[PDB]
Subunit: 277 residues, 6 copies
Amino acid sequence: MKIGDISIHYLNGGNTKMDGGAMFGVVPKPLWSKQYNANERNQINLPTHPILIQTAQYNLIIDAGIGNGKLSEKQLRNFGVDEESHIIADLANYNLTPKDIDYVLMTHMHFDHAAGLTDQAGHAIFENAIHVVQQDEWHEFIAPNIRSKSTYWDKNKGDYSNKLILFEKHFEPVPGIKMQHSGGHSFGHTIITIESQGDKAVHMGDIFPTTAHKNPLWVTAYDDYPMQSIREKERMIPYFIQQQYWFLFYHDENYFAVKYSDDGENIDAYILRETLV
Amino acid sequence: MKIGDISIHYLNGGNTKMDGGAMFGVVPKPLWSKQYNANERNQINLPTHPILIQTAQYNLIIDAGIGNGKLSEKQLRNFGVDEESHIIADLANYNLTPKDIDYVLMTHMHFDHAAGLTDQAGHAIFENAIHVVQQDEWHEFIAPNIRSKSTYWDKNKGDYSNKLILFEKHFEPVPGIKMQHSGGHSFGHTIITIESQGDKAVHMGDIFPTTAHKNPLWVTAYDDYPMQSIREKERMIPYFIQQQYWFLFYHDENYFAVKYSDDGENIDAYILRET
Amino acid sequence: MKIGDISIHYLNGGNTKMDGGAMFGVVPKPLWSKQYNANERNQINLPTHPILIQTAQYNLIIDAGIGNGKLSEKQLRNFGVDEESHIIADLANYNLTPKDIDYVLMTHMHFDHAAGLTDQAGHAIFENAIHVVQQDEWHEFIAPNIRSKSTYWDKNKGDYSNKLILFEKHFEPVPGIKMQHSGGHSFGHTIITIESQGDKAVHMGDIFPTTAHKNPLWVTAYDDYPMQSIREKERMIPYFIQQQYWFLFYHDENYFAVKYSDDGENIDAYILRET
Amino acid sequence: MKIGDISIHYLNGGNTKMDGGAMFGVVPKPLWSKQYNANERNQINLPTHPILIQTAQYNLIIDAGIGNGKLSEKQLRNFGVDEESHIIADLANYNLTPKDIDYVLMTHMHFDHAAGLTDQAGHAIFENAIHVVQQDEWHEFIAPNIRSKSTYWDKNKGDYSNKLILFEKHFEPVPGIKMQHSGGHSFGHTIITIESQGDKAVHMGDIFPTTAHKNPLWVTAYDDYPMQSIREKERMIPYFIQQQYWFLFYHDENYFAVKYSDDGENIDAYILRET
Amino acid sequence: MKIGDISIHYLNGGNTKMDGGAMFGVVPKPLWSKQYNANERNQINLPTHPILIQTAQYNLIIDAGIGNGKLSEKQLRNFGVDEESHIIADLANYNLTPKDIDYVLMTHMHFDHAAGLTDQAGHAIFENAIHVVQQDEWHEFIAPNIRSKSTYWDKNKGDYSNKLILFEKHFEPVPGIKMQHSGGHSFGHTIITIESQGDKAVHMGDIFPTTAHKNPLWVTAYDDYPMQSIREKERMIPYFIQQQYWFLFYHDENYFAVKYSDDGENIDAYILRETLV
Amino acid sequence: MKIGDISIHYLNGGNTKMDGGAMFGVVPKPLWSKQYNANERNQINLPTHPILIQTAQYNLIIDAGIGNGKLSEKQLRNFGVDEESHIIADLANYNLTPKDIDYVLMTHMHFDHAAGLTDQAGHAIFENAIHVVQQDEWHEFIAPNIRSKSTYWDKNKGDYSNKLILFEKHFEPVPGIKMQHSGGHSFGHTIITIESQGDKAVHMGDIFPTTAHKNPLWVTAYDDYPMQSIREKERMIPYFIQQQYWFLFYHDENYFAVKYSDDGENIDAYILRET
């Protein structure tokens, strides 16, 4: 993928199998099962593939996958992990090492996105990288309630917190990369946009998980504030489409990106996610 | 049943079938499917049974099922309606006719609770009945947003509004009956407690739909503000149990009332529903 | 006129006559009648002249007037309409047709500002134009409450919504043109600015209706949140004046454009509206 | 009159004449001038008659009128004052002196309601009386903003503050008398209710100024938060009517007490004010 | 102490020495040092004495002191603890055992108030007692931020949480005892009032720590929301005085209670706190 | 000092002595007393030194010490004033006189920052200067509450308000200078960043009073909203350090500017203050 001078790729940070009903909330199964595949256990396959962004000067990732040795044996099974992260080997394919990374931008701190931030002993994969998190997202991450406790794990704390930078509403790390507090899925959930030359790309995190969640009303049950999720989706998606943005995905098993035609119905351009088995 | 000097019963206002996942949210099917049955279309059976309350003077009612013919063919099929409201009949079995009512107390105005409020021409099924609805709930009902439009129907508007009484935080219509605003399921969602002598009963509406939703974390995906739902459930349930309250249900297909042991671990008493 | 390399005129989308006491809130008549006229109905004449902005590659329109055949017989009379929109004609006087308008920017969706967006049968005058509305202002438009119902009309919905775009706090449709959510008059009220070279112009919508509303304390009674209106006026006006901005009007029957002295106690330059 | 075992009359604490457009917000003159009179200054006559409540052991007063020699030469003229307070006299007609008043309950601290609390030199009419004000209403009174500055006067501060008591949402000074924060007209606006036996009375202050403001949509332009005013009126009035409450007025030149039919479309019983 | 049919007493739950400057916030030392005594280390002595309330039917406590064996050696020194809790022996003086207690009502969960809730191994002193806490207070107690972390300790969790009842704004446990959410010192801080016959008593917790904090403007620097503290004090104190309430204290070294004369200046009645050395 | 094309210096606007505990809040004396000296009265020395900024066109100024004679005898003693403002003199050393100023940018209006804004008759020390103050800060200043009345003085009002420009979230007066609303110390508290070429400087006002307040948890007891102060400090400081910003101080007696190592552990560069 290329957006102007910026190169965009995905990294195999592992995968998870989550219950379809929970990933589609109010949408009846008969309808969502036709848009996304589920197994005998009502689980749909959700890759956890970080997004590698390379500008002329900086290298950065959008999330960190499920890591290596982080999830227990019970969690690996309960979360349908087929394979753990291959983020090191994948990075090599681009002549990079978990040390040439300058920024790790987080959409949110749920385990499916932050487990791969540190190895065991909570050291920290990505030692020279500055880590950016929305301030309230971070606050809840370290002080989760009886509900967010299930995904915000102490086990995911670590050294990276040394080079931690917090932002409230918006933040532009390196030119062209803009983070923006969306809320909805998470109180501190963030979306990221990439712009180089005239090209535009956007990753709406878990506020637009997969291509099957394009309908603003189709939000996951995980969303702590679904009304805010809908609000954001109702306005962002039509705008990004009108502006001919490329939609990047972290969880979609089939596609890595998509560009809808100036209409809002037909998504002509789908960039397939060729994940090695 | 018996709640001090107050008598309580329920009415067959019809039934519906909602998608299991929509009803349990983040709870994996493998877990809730063992707590509540689902067909092959993945739907669970949910009665819409209004609760009839009678005191030495009034006989208000909680909700009004789905009604009779208020739903269209399409809707009758999409929500899996097997039988429409028998409200008029059931009420008769208690020497009460569609007119004796003294107060229709709403928990919220979603179609599965208010469609039975009027006939096909939007005329009140309950003339002479003061309809108490939470103020903010009433506003959203008559002014739905792109998501609320699915349950809030213009078609459920009617003459009953000419005897509409709104409230904010809490309201005690008749002695012993208290309506408390909870939010969660819908912004204006309300629960209702009935207390007389030493007895206590409570109906937590869609913030505690069925006995399978006892865990505060098990909230429906329909809840517009799940964080508020959990907040309310986390505090109410332990309190009502500690106080030995009877939990009344509107959508539960197996129970009408339940009373938990002094630790919430099990069901100590209960009243199944129907024949 | 023209701000830098951007051309700007005013279209005649009709007019209306609203009560004076309504247009001046707490301001006594013995004072506002010396700044504006009160026919004997106590109505003041309020034109509904949309603003046309022409840059290098785009044609924009701020609000759309009352339209043609949109208001009923009754409305025409109560809103004191003398002449309905001549928007089509006025545009022609600029070799511009309704299909050349690239953007329609709305300050708020009240009828005197949006009625002109569609013809009857709710088709849509201005096909091909992206319609920009601030989110909350659009949410309320399609879901009015008992007070907004009077100005947010259902017959004002239309095809234009197929090319609708929403923004929350600020948005730049095209270089130099900035939309900013102000609130006050209506929860989602929005003001607009135009900048080219060192030239600056601003239209503060119904938060600064006419030149007679310059005093921040002089807000209309129509304002749903007068405290926010004052807040915005108290800060914007002094700033725009200090920056030598041209104030554009939609409702001032006399002035179209105005610029205050640095001391802002007088109007140095102005452009009258050829009624 | 008297509610149950509580006596209630009205004192003449002076009067004022305020603009009509200001008193009726968005309501057109051709409509409000048929419900109230507009001298030619466009002013309507607003008495400032404090309400006297006498129970078994206490004497209470709601608001205090404009006082004596409190308004300057200029104010007297602009607020159309015909007669200054006769509060001392009127009280005497009840064998009551200013030192027998046990409680002074305020709806809000605007001048037409608080000017009468102290004489010049800000001493304090009504020594020995506990003065009840809602917290935020008092905070704003002593710290007015650019808009409140017009009605919250510094010369209205006084000794009475040595016996001041504040409440936030609700407060019962003496059995049967309840104060409730309503907001709307002023952030800290407060309405009051009196109950004895099955008799009920209520004074909704400036959230229901005169009988002509019964329509919830008819709020004054003075209301700093009109949306909250409507909210409160929309719910309170229907409830108070359903409960057969007597509506007491402070500003209605004609009526002092009123009671609507159950259907609330007519005024069944009333008490005129002997101007 | 007797309020109508209700008997009120204090229990020696230990003590703590906190920095005076922090306990008086904006009040210059020259002024507060004359109202409360400080040592060479600027520390003032603050007893942590729970309030025993006995009605005809129920027995209850207002807080739990610093406990026994709960604070470490480093904390005992840093917090100027002279003696640890004597709550068991004190209770005996009234023919009661840490088992005859029906309700433990908490004003807030800071360590100076909640450490004595459980013994080591977090079992739970007061096994048959129902524990009442404001819902938000509790939420922060288990999910404290970088600031409240210093007083909300995991080490204070325990069995008592089994019979935990939460309330939002107000709650009346047994007739005459009314809890009320005040906020200010803590987001979930609560005050308690006692009424029997015509007698009235009130404990405003850390929103009125000692008799030296009567001036509404004299709030501790510990208060997370001082503006709300002042708001509450500005209105409550004058009202409680006008109503001839007895003010009960948990932290005042000299006095256990006080009744100001219908004025708001002279506090004629002071009930001394005879603490055994 | 040098910040790209922008020149920065500071001025002796006088000094004060505040109680150490008030200044460090919850931080025990034994800890802060080792970070900042205190006399036997427990007071710490705090200069009130305005910061002079000069660009190729303007030369705005940050704060205005305490002034000259604005403080009374009592105040001069209670706040431990040793010397009053030498603002006029210092300004001269830079060929600038009390009139050249082009913008007085306030962080907040507490007396130790704004008393130097006017003379003994409330006349602006800085005619020709546009005074930029945060909107909400300005409101509280002119409308103090029982606690704010201690720093907000009526006596600090003046003609300067005739050139007052308010803002809400952020404002960039002249290129490179950005004012950002932070809250914390006071509701309207503002910080100011200066950036030119690759250089960056920031003055966090009373949200980072002295170098001893670097720990986000070390906030003054004066802060009306300490939780917001911590929030801002927790995020700003690490960011400004990562970006190699120069931290400018107004109250620090030893440093004027400081630059931390790339880890905040130590002070890598600095400019002491005075001779």
